[PDB]
């Protein structure tokens, strides 16, 4: 019961199942295409603080995947490495054949800890995590992915690092990592470009920790 789009010299139509269109010729299987599109193209927020609120954990439901033949370049991809407070892993290792998304502009790598209630992390809106040419219902550990959806039809990076605490819950906190001992408090009003600009002025000017302590920066509210 999965719909197919049909591309005409008019517009994009959705193929029926009850109505047979005699002129909708299919000459080969090469005219059928699976396309992975990103959610960012619909205006969903992409900052880390808001993104992680769309994900959550559950048990009793197995993971599954489907393939793509083509897809979009992502401006914002994510890569998670989350551990439980006791040091154990939250996310499963990716299985053979799963590789990261090939075309990301900024990768938001989040490392940290938090409660992990289930077996797997699932998307709450039912969107898929997009891996190289495979969409998945779950997040795999250490693998870069984009969020998105898959269409079927008839045809005729800069790496930004963050630390996280309380990753799997509602009230969580994040830091932007400049150096091993240098961090900036993260806010939802920051864009990837903003963070890169802060990394250049702080690092270049030497406003970094010299002692063994952690230097934590807070952006002026204005």
């Amino acid at each position, epitope marked *: 019961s999965i719909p197919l789009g049909v591309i005409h010299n008019s517009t994009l139509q959705v193929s029926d199942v009850d109505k047979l269109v005699c002129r909708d010729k299919l000459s080969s299987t090469n005219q059928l295409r699976s396309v992975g599109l990103n959610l960012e193209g619909n205006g969903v927020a992409t900052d880390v603080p808001s993104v992680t609120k769309r994900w959550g954990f559950r048990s009793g439901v197995p993971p599954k995947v489907v393939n793509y033949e083509a897809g979009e370049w992502a401006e914002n991809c994510y890569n998670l490495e989350i551990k439980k407070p006791d040091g154990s892993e939250c996310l499963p290792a990716a299985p053979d054949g799963i590789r990261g998304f090939p075309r990301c502009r900024y990768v938001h790598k989040v490392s940290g800890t938090g409660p992990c209630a289930g077996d797997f992390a699932f998307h709450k809106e039912g969107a898929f995590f997009l891996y190289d040419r495979l969409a998945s219902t779950v997040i795999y550990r250490g693998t870069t992915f984009a969020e998105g959806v898959v269409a079927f039809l008839i045809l005729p990076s800069t790496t930004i690092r963050y630390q996280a605490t309380g990753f799997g819950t509602n009230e969580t*906190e994040y*830091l932007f990592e400049v150096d091993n001992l240098t*961090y900036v408090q993260l806010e939802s009003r920051f864009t990837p470009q903003f963070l890169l600009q802060l990394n250049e002025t702080i690092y270049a000017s030497g406003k970094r*920790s010299n002692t063994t*302590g*952690k230097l934590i920066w*807070k952006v002026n509210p204005e």
Partner: antibody
Framework: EVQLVESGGGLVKPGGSLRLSCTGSGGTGFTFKYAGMSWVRQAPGKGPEWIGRIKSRIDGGTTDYAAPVKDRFIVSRDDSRNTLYLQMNSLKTEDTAVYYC????????????????????????WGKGTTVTVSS | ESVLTQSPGTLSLSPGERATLSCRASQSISRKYLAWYQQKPGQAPRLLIYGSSSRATGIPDRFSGSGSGTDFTLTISRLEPEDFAVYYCHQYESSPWTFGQGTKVEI
């Protein structure tokens, strides 16, 4: 700029227990983006003794204890209330001491960008010390 | 464990004279993990020096630490009347913390 002040002391009988507290201000909150906090005690006539310290949540939130208090004292924090606590069980009269809270903090350099603080693995800020007396 | 022992137990020097106090650790330790503290009755100890050789702020230049391995020293180039306090060593050990026993400095 950081200050922390101890309370919850006074006279307790041996074989009992008590919980000390230390509430501060001048920092950026003591739970996240902050130094962990320790307890140190000093009996009159003696030097300081490390009890243990609670790490910040960004550093895991665990407690590292000194051997002399293992399995008797617990170091914990009231998150976002900027308050450090010490639960001392199985009290003996040997535990009479002044109990101090201590913090690895203080303000760092500023920039046109924003403000900053440092969180250390040593102590810059000491509280006043609350005396705990354990006696019959 | 890694334990700090101070020597001499008491230092005796007129103000204006140089003073040194050493600590010997039972275990070798890197410089970045050492500190000394200054205590007077009624006060919590002041930091003075940390990281073996890095001065704490609010501390005069006459106070300078040095050392490596198991042997560390605090040197006061000229000991002033206001500096005749009890001094302690401290080490971080990358996890457990240790304090020295307390050494008295007298005129």
């Amino acid at each position: 700029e950081v200050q922390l002040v101890e309370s919850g002391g006074g006279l307790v009988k041996p074989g009992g227990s008590l919980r000390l507290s230390c509430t501060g201000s001048g920092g950026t909150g003591f739970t996240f983006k902050y130094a962990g906090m320790s307890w140190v005690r000093q009996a009159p006539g003696k030097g300081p003794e490390w009890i243990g310290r609670i790490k910040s949540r960004i550093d895991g939130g665990t407690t590292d204890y000194a051997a002399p208090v293992k399995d008797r004292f617990i170091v914990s924090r009231d998150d976002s209330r900027n308050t450090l606590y010490l639960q001392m069980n199985s009290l003996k009269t040997e535990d009479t001491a002044v109990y101090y809270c201590a913090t690895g903090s203080g303000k760092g350099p500023s920039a046109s960008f924003g403000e900053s603080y440092y969180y250390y693995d040593f102590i810059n800020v000491w509280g006043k010390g609350t005396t705990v007396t354990v006696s019959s | 464990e890694s334990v700090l022992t101070q020597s001499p137990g008491t230092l005796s020097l007129s103000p204006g004279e140089r003073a040194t106090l050493s600590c010997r650790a039972s275990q070798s330790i890197s410089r970045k993990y050492l500190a000394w503290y200054q205590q007077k009755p009624g006060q919590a100890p002041r930091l003075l020096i940390y990281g073996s050789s890095s001065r704490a702020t609010g501390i005069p230049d006459r106070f300078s630490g040095s050392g490596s391995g198991t042997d560390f020293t605090l040197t006061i180039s000229r000991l002033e009347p206001e500096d005749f306090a009890v001094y302690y060593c401290h080490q971080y050990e990358s996890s457990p913390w240790t304090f020295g026993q307390g050494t008295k400095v007298e005129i």
